[model samples]
Target: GPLGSEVIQALIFKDDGSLGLSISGGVGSSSFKSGDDGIFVSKIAKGGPCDNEGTLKIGDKILSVNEISFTGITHEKAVEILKNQDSKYMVVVERS
Candidate 1:
């Protein structure tokens, strides 16, 4: 079998100073696998920043953050970078 997915460049802004989202899976996490799994959106706050933006959806896999590759990082590293993001940041994601 073969797989194909679409990429999305989501320009996320911290409206009200929060992304209003959470993520799941990364190196050493129970849900992680050793390939291109990356990290995924675990939850989205209703009527919040990302929800209002409408580009990001739950289950979208993040590929890059602010041009920094996110493909093979640990869950802690992912959390660190995401926490340090600027008010406005760019994320490359994949969804199908």
Candidate 2:
């Protein structure tokens, strides 16, 4: 009975530019699925971006990264976008 949307910006925690997330759809699980669901924030790797950032949560699914839609794309593609090796990304997260 309660569903909407809320948006927040999750910065990539990297001196070189990265979100510090090793994400997956958690396939075979009751939740996230790679080609069929929004990419979930699987984990925040050590000594990377977001480690010191106290804002990002592990279980949050990404809505957008730097104005690029995280939807309509496979998880692998999403990772490529985020982990592009290019330092300059600002993630905008949206959830219901």
Candidate 3:
């Protein structure tokens, strides 16, 4: 049986020490509700790595990076997780 949510597996490499994308919504955040609505891609820089990849898009919920879970993680910690990644890594996401 097919599910409602679509899973996206992307293998992206960073350029100039950046993944070229911004994320929002995480645990214990006021602006964005937690739990159900975890971290999501807020922006994708034009002509950047993620943009050139052409698979990732804004509003896509990030499930994991390099198999590291983003659920129940703090916004700041999530940033750290992404920052600590290698030049090349895999990103798992859910899109509706």
Candidate 4:
């Protein structure tokens, strides 16, 4: 039997000019969707950082990345901000 359910990865954790997501850097597997409802996480690949103790859930709202708010962020900008990271990242999210 297989047990491949939603691979709960931290959508960065439990927002603003504050601390959030705070996951270990190099998780590199967590992904999300951006829209009016905010950035919603999709999944985490196997053997990613959060997987060690992954506590992320779907529907978690992405509040900020690093320290940037998602209020006026475009999809590209958000993607860029995420890509620009060179070290550990801190993502703040509202628990679902």
- Candidate with best lDDT: 3
Q: Report the candidate with higher TM-score, 1 versus 3.
A: 3
Model 2 Cα lDDT, one tens digit per residue, 1-96: 986766778666466555567666623433474344777777876767777665666766777777887776776677677666466557776555
Model 3 poorest ten-residue lDDT run:
28-37
Model 4 residue 28 CA deviation in Å: 25
Residue 33 lDDT in candidate 2: 45
Per-residue lDDT tens digits of candidate 1, residues 5-83? 8899988788886787887888777564345447888799998888888898888888888997878887789899988
* lDDT winner between candidates 1 and 2: 1
Model 1 accuracy (lDDT, Cα): 0.82
Better of 2 and 4 by lDDT: 2
* Cα RMSD to the true fold for all candidates: 2.1, 3.8, 2.8, 10.3
lDDT of 2: 0.66
Inter-residue clash pairs, candidate 1: none
lDDT of each: 0.82, 0.66, 0.85, 0.47
Give the lowest summed-lDDT range of ten residues in model 2.
26-35
10 residues in a row with least lDDT, candidate 1: 28-37
Instruction: Please list the residue runs of candidate 1 whose C-alpha ends up more than 4 Å from where it truly belongs after superposition.
Output: 32-37
Highest TM-score among the candidates is held by which one? 3
User: Please, what are the lDDT tens digits per residue for candidate 4 over residues 6-75?
Assistant: 3222333212221223222112223343224355554544445444436655455566657777545555
